Amino acid sequence: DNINTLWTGVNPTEANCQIMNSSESNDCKLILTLVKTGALVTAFVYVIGVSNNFNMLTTHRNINFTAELFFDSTGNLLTRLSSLKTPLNHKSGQNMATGAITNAKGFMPSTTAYPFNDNSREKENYIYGTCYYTASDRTAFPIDISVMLNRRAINDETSYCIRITWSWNTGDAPEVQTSATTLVTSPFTFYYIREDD
Amino acid sequence: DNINTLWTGVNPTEANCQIMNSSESNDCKLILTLVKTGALVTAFVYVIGVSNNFNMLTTHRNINFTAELFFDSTGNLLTRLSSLKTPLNHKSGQNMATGAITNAKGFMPSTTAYPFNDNSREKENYIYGTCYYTASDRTAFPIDISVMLNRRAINDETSYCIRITWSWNTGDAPEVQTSATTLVTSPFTFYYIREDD
Amino acid sequence: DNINTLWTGVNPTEANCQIMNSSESNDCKLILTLVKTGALVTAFVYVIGVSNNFNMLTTHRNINFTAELFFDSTGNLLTRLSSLKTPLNHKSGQNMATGAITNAKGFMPSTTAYPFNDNSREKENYIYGTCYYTASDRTAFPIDISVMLNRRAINDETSYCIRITWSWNTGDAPEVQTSATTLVTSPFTFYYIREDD
Amino acid sequence: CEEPPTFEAMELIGKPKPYYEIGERVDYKCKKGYFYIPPLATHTICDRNHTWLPVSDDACYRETCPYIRDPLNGQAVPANGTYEFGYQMHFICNEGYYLIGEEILYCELKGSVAIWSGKPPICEKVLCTPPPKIKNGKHTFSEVEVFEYLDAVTYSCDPAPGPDPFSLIGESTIYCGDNSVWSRAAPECKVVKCRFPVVENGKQISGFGKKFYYKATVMFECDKGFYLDGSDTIVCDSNSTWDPPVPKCLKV
Amino acid sequence: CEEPPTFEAMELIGKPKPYYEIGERVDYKCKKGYFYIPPLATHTICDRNHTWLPVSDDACYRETCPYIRDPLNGQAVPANGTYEFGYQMHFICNEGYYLIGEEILYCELKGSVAIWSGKPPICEKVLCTPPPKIKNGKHTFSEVEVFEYLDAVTYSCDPAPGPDPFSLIGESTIYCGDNSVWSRAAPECKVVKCRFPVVENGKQISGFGKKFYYKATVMFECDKGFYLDGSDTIVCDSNSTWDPPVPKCLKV
Amino acid sequence: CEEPPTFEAMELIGKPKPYYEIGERVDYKCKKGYFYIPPLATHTICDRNHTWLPVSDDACYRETCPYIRDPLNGQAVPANGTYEFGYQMHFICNEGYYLIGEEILYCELKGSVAIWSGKPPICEKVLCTPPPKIKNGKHTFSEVEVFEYLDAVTYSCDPAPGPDPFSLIGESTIYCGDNSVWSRAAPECKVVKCRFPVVENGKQISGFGKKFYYKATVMFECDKGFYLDGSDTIVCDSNSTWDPPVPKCLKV
Ligand SMILES: *[C@@H]1O[C@H](CO)[C@@H](O[C@@H]2O[C@H](CO)[C@@H](O)[C@H](O)[C@H]2NC(C)=O)[C@H](O)[C@H]1NC(C)=O
Ligand SMILES: *[C@@H]1O[C@H](CO)[C@@H](O[C@@H]2O[C@H](CO)[C@@H](O)[C@H](O)[C@H]2NC(C)=O)[C@H](O)[C@H]1NC(C)=O
Ligand SMILES: *[C@@H]1O[C@H](CO)[C@@H](O[C@@H]2O[C@H](CO)[C@@H](O)[C@H](O)[C@H]2NC(C)=O)[C@H](O)[C@H]1NC(C)=O
Ligand SMILES: *[C@@H]1O[C@H](CO)[C@@H](O[C@@H]2O[C@H](CO)[C@@H](O)[C@H](O)[C@H]2NC(C)=O)[C@H](O)[C@H]1NC(C)=O
Ligand SMILES: *[C@@H]1O[C@H](CO)[C@@H](O[C@@H]2O[C@H](CO)[C@@H](O)[C@H](O)[C@H]2NC(C)=O)[C@H](O)[C@H]1NC(C)=O
Ligand SMILES: *[C@@H]1O[C@H](CO)[C@@H](O[C@@H]2O[C@H](CO)[C@@H](O)[C@H](O)[C@H]2NC(C)=O)[C@H](O)[C@H]1NC(C)=O
């Protein structure tokens, strides 16, 4: 069934995410897919660059960018606070659904497993991984991923939080001003215990 | 449905695992989640330290600890032999179920794919991965994971075996006596071919 | 249900794959498992060596081998073109099913997410990972994995493509002529957006 | 309802309107380096009296960097006071120890997690090379290759090269300083011999002898009906000259 | 229907039959280093007239390696023309620069992806050690330790060690070459003095003097009824000998 | 049913009771470094005759470490016999080869998998520095910088510095040993000349001559009615002294 997936869709025509502070409007395409897998959620996440400034991050040595995702009590995306400006919905072929979201709270990371402001359980709120950047010379550049589930709230509305940080610190930059085209990260898959329906 | 998951639950009040030989009673919380994914099993595993001795492993350079899991012919956990002292059950919100386990043999690693005492197929019984430790200075420490499916039996009762080994060998220890608090490993997800229902 | 899986089966008696150009007949056993997970596919892939020449690749320093998988418009494997010479089918215990394949197009990598011959979207067609080789001295040897989804077509029949490349470039070879037995890679799991049913 | 209230810990979401209607709701969020703690509200609604309902930034708490343990034979001093966001950590090594690494670390924020600029520095033991070799003189611990903190060496001139001996100019004992450099400059072993001081219409009163070397003190007294022009006390300097110059007794 | 047609871009799938029946289908696939572009067909069926239907390899396009940007103070020259599969890339550094890395890179195919053999080379600045030290002579920039490209040094002999001065043999000015070696061999500072040239039945016409050093030119003219045996012009060489040898005037 | 039986390969699960009831079941498991092979039972039930049913540890088999291939120009010797758990592997290099790495490897168990302590060592070729330079003497292969195993050098003294030549004390030929050190100490080239041996009431019988050098043998015979006090045979030592001392013929 299509109700087991909560996604952004496949390659949206326009940019749906404002990933960096310096940007005034939407800078990139955030491809996020949340699939219900028993008591866990298969989280599939990657970015496709749109703006000139975001694509030019491949010309720098030390770079870090975070995709902030905030959700309310019912498990609905808070677009005004989150990096993603388009709300998530069910599978409709290769696009998002139009109607109501069946058990949005079910796709949310558990507060029991990933608590808020509990310093004695801080370590449990973190997930680390690696994705790759296909450079102009067709070689893979490794990018570090820092995932924070819940832990920090920004206001009275934020009941569920997901933070994904892509970063790299190397001696040589992935690309140069003449070789750089589009900043595209390889799909990263992480696992977390889901909140009840 | 809840029957597709066989787990330990979410953050049990008391320690449910005796991971090390030196311990007399239960030393840590083993969070194990087995989700049926077609002909495969999504195995989600991580540890949360309880005892002072287990939490103090972060002060040492060369450390290795194994979580032994033994199962009978019907696919039920043998608590007296296994590291985990509480039997696994289905999803009941954020806790374990009380009643009967539907197709416990289905969550077990296949004897056809992962044989017992077959030296010409030894290499097939191993799975390797990496998890991270969030240190006091908020940096991620990589920990090597060695997973052995079936391969070795301990007695006439052990029909299905799962062994998870967390290890590290570095020049500098992750923490010091004053910085060390709780030994918590990041969630590790591995895949294996499941035995028939 | 068994229809959610499209696999090669578990350890086939005879070699079902001709992975290298130098081989005249089938050289190894390709274990491929495709499980439908919402809008994604859980792809489980590894190789078990059969021929003497393929098992002897562990005696060399610089090695690279690709498993080419080609599919038609309906999502059926083209055995005459692909490395795998036996067609994929549903779960039947620990073996393949005999009858018709329910929605074969559903297991295929999406043309919307992974396009063909689109140079401005080239980076999106790549997936990178790591598997391990259990050496004679019982140590794990890391092997780089390069996965190309769709991107390149070979003829008018190839509508869906999956290319898996296992490679290593080290100073010391994994094994020697006296220590080498069987080339077995650890199971690798990758994720991709699936085409519609 | 006019412009919404401004807070130090929380910032308004969206552009503020010059005028608001009755019932309009405005939301706030904790600033960069601040986190929310329940149950206090971070939003306000305009009441029937055209005013904003009471709201405070008391729910937003400051994000802090991890506790830096004092380095061995050194100290970590928070220049701004605490471990709060936007603050720095200064490092000073103890007497006889030098810094290796970053002297200053800044409290940064990377993916809503407070992290320091880098790894804390190490305070290594101060070691210095042998003291300078002087002409016509030798020092103690001559065969010692490496000197540690506060290790002192005493200089002494070679025996007399004839009727006049070698004079030591400056401090004889020098030690290894905090900056891996010797406390004072190496002394000189030079033959210092001053001319016989003779004052016209004046008599010598102190420091009698035929030969005058380094730091030799001689005093003079003028005869009846004669005034002293300069200083009565004269000391022989390092360059074999009387400092102040030899006085003169002038007639009244 | 006889053997199926052969193409340069696409190859037949399976072994070819010597004879085919009416309706039989044969399929082709793009060769190694070639990719398919739709909609043109890559298969043919034998028609009722026992011939193969029209088919072309126009759908198969050549696989190309990534564009190599010219190295700083050097150039990337495609020896075979393009970036196509099976071709190579040659690297040549500019005047006063040497190559570090691989001079030649080959366009390879690894997992249906066109990739170069390795990373492109770097053209580093040419630097050379001081020029050779010569006996009885000195060069300019004597205290300079490291010399860069085109840096020239002029050699000059020491003052006269008596009545005859030191003669300079060869080029005085030498520069740092492209192969990190000095352009020419270091000159010689040797005392060159030739014997007084005297020809029987002949008179001297040019280069008058009592002493003859390096490169000294002397001309001779024979007396009445005498022919010259050799060359009239004689030059003193580096080994203090007349080259060509001193002429002789023989009687007619 | 009393205490359950004890086995060398398998251990009892849980604390043993001093007394058991009829029907009570006790289970065993293979010890650390042992694995189970079916179908033999690893459990026993107490029968009606208050005794335990027959059970054996024959199902538990010893865990073994991987086979270590003999190192090039060396050998791997299992000190305890096999590759079993708790055993060690010793390494000895062949004649003219030295060990690089760990001489001893222990069979360990990490996550129920038998693995060795580390990587096996390498036996590198034995090479030694030139032999010691001796005063008044020279050796063969004087210009050779590096010497390999069994390479021998012969020493020879310089020509006579007058009427007496240089004497060679010790072995002339020395070779490169197994411990990268020269087999024997370098010989001496010293002028050895002994005093003329004269015995009162005794006559010389062998080794006639006017000059006596190193290792010179002289024999003595006493006259009629005289007994020898010491040894008849005397040899000149390295320190120009007769060893044993010059004999004396004493009257009877
Ligand atoms: C508008 O303002 C009036 C005047 O201050 C508020 O009425 C007062 O409310 C307080 C608190 O309950 C009482 O102690 C006074 O007796 C009230 N005075 C009068 C004159 O009414 C009123 O509550 C406000 N209304 C709204 C809707 O916010
Ligand atoms: C924190 O303290 C530091 C150090 O005292 C302040 O930085 C100094 O600021 C003054 C005035 O602008 C300058 O003259 C110095 O050069 C600075 N020194 C260093 C080491 O940075 C800083 O402004 C304070 N910041 C806050 C937020 O309190
Ligand atoms: C077999 O060959 C014949 C002869 O060339 C083909 O018939 C010709 O077809 C062309 C094209 O339509 C026409 O212009 C001519 O008028 C035809 N000539 C005759 C004599 O029939 C025919 O099409 C071929 N048949 C098949 C089944 O391929
Ligand atoms: C591409 O060009 C290269 C370089 O010109 C060719 O390689 C040369 O081939 C000739 C003839 O066989 C040899 O004499 C040279 O030694 C080769 N040089 C190098 C550097 O390889 C090559 O054959 C050409 N290949 C194609 C496919 O066009
Ligand atoms: C208890 O012990 C008795 C005595 O040994 C067992 O009976 C014997 O069993 C053997 C084996 O079948 C026969 O050969 C003998 O004829 C039996 N002798 C007698 C006197 O009965 C008996 O089997 C045991 N019972 C249990 C329940 O273990
Ligand atoms: C295996 O063999 C080793 C080596 O012979 C034994 O270790 C020696 O034990 C003796 C007696 O305790 C000591 O004197 C030596 O110092 C030991 N040598 C080394 C190199 O360890 C060992 O005890 C034997 N172990 C077993 C289980 O058979």
Numbering used by the authors:
A (entry chain A), B (entry chain A), C (entry chain A): 129 to 325
D (entry chain B), E (entry chain B), F (entry chain B): 1 to 252
List sentences quoted exactly from the publication behind this structure.
The human CD46 receptor, also known as membrane cofactor protein (MCP), is present on all nucleated cells. CD46 acts as a key regulator in the classical and alternative complement activation cascades of the innate immune system by serving as a cofactor for the factor I - mediated cleavage of C3b and C4b. In addition to its role in complement activation and regulation of the adaptive immune response, CD46 is used as a cellular receptor by several viruses and bacteria. The four SCRs in CD46 constitute the bulk of its extracellular region.
We have determined the three-dimensional structure of all four SCR domains of CD46, which constitutes the bulk of the extracellular region of this cell surface receptor protein, in complex with the Ad11 knob. The Ad11 knob, which can easily be crystallized in its unbound form and engages in a high-affinity complex with the SCR1 and SCR2 domains of CD46-2D, was then used to form a complex with CD46-4D for crystallization. This strategy produced crystals that diffracted to 2.84 Å resolution, allowing us to trace the polypeptide chains for the entire complex. The asymmetric unit of the crystals contains two Ad11 knob protomers that are located in different trimers, and are each complexed with a single CD46-4D molecule. At the center of the complex lies the trimeric Ad11 knob structure, which, in support of previous findings, engages domains SCR1 and SCR2 but does not interact with domains SCR3 and SCR4 of CD46. The SCR1-SCR2 segment adopts a rod-like conformation that is similar but not identical to the one seen in the earlier crystal structure of Ad11 knob in complex with CD46-2D. By contrast, SCR2 has moved away from the knob in the Ad11 knob - CD46-4D complex, and the number of contacts have been reduced significantly. The overall structure of CD46-4D can therefore best be described as resembling a hockey stick, with the N-terminal three domains forming the “shaft” and SCR4 forming the “blade”. The interface between SCR3 and SCR4 is unique among the three CD46 interdomain interfaces as it has by far the largest buried surface area (729 Å2) and features a profound kink. The conformation of the proline-rich loop is incompatible with a more linear arrangement of the SCR3 and SCR4 modules, and since it mediates a large number of interdomain contacts we conclude that this loop is responsible for the profound kink between these two domains. Intriguingly, the sites for the natural ligands C3b and C4b mostly involve the glycan-free aspects of CD46 and cluster in several smaller areas on SCR2 and SCR3 as well as a large region of SCR4, near the SCR3-SCR4 interface.
